mmCIF file of C-alpha atoms in Angstrom:
data_model
loop_
_atom_site.group_PDB
_atom_site.id
_atom_site.type_symbol
_atom_site.label_atom_id
_atom_site.label_comp_id
_atom_site.label_asym_id
_atom_site.label_seq_id
_atom_site.Cartn_x
_atom_site.Cartn_y
_atom_site.Cartn_z
ATOM 1 C CA UNK A 1 -43.530 90.991 -77.363
ATOM 2 C CA UNK A 2 -44.333 87.515 -78.846
ATOM 3 C CA UNK A 3 -46.001 84.791 -77.313
ATOM 4 C CA UNK A 4 -46.023 81.071 -79.282
ATOM 5 C CA UNK A 5 -49.376 80.449 -77.212
ATOM 6 C CA UNK A 6 -51.709 83.032 -79.563
ATOM 7 C CA UNK A 7 -52.381 80.409 -82.148
ATOM 8 C CA UNK A 8 -51.816 83.018 -84.830
ATOM 9 C CA UNK A 9 -51.763 80.108 -87.472
ATOM 10 C CA UNK A 10 -54.582 79.008 -86.828
ATOM 11 C CA UNK A 11 -56.989 81.874 -87.612
ATOM 12 C CA UNK A 12 -54.978 82.073 -90.963
ATOM 13 C CA UNK A 13 -56.226 78.099 -91.774
ATOM 14 C CA UNK A 14 -59.630 78.997 -89.979
ATOM 15 C CA UNK A 15 -59.649 82.689 -92.224
ATOM 16 C CA UNK A 16 -59.276 80.697 -95.902
ATOM 17 C CA UNK A 17 -62.555 78.878 -93.961
ATOM 18 C CA UNK A 18 -64.128 81.940 -93.833
ATOM 19 C CA UNK A 19 -64.354 81.959 -97.562
ATOM 20 C CA UNK A 20 -65.297 78.305 -98.279
ATOM 21 C CA UNK A 21 -68.253 77.758 -97.187
ATOM 22 C CA UNK A 22 -67.615 75.406 -94.507
ATOM 23 C CA UNK A 23 -69.797 74.214 -90.791
ATOM 24 C CA UNK A 24 -68.784 74.313 -87.219
ATOM 25 C CA UNK A 25 -71.371 71.708 -85.259
ATOM 26 C CA UNK A 26 -68.459 71.520 -83.118
ATOM 27 C CA UNK A 27 -67.569 74.817 -83.266
ATOM 28 C CA UNK A 28 -64.251 73.567 -84.966
ATOM 29 C CA UNK A 29 -64.044 76.386 -87.410
ATOM 30 C CA UNK A 30 -61.779 76.630 -84.562
ATOM 31 C CA UNK A 31 -60.866 73.726 -82.764
ATOM 32 C CA UNK A 32 -60.585 71.451 -86.800
ATOM 33 C CA UNK A 33 -57.164 72.784 -86.589
ATOM 34 C CA UNK A 34 -56.066 73.167 -83.528
ATOM 35 C CA UNK A 35 -57.072 68.560 -83.423
ATOM 36 C CA UNK A 36 -56.442 69.081 -87.123
ATOM 37 C CA UNK A 37 -53.223 70.177 -87.059
ATOM 38 C CA UNK A 38 -53.903 72.918 -88.719
ATOM 39 C CA UNK A 39 -54.512 70.774 -91.792
ATOM 40 C CA UNK A 40 -56.993 72.414 -93.547
ATOM 41 C CA UNK A 41 -56.376 71.363 -96.543
ATOM 42 C CA UNK A 42 -56.326 67.649 -95.095
ATOM 43 C CA UNK A 43 -60.043 68.472 -93.078
ATOM 44 C CA UNK A 44 -61.240 70.442 -96.469
ATOM 45 C CA UNK A 45 -61.738 66.526 -97.610
ATOM 46 C CA UNK A 46 -63.284 65.658 -94.199
ATOM 47 C CA UNK A 47 -64.412 69.867 -93.679
ATOM 48 C CA UNK A 48 -66.077 70.493 -97.721
ATOM 49 C CA UNK A 49 -67.285 66.876 -97.247
ATOM 50 C CA UNK A 50 -67.652 65.225 -100.793
ATOM 51 C CA UNK A 51 -68.465 61.051 -99.518
ATOM 52 C CA UNK A 52 -72.238 60.308 -100.203
#
């Protein structure tokens, strides 16, 4: 079996964020990937919030 509707690539990116120390205000650690096209690397800049 191999349903393309499992989003198995989100857990991967979510896995690296699990060892990061991120937040989840709007529970984005799960939807972020979905919203930021799993670009946690690019989202990292928004997920690590380094602006002032």
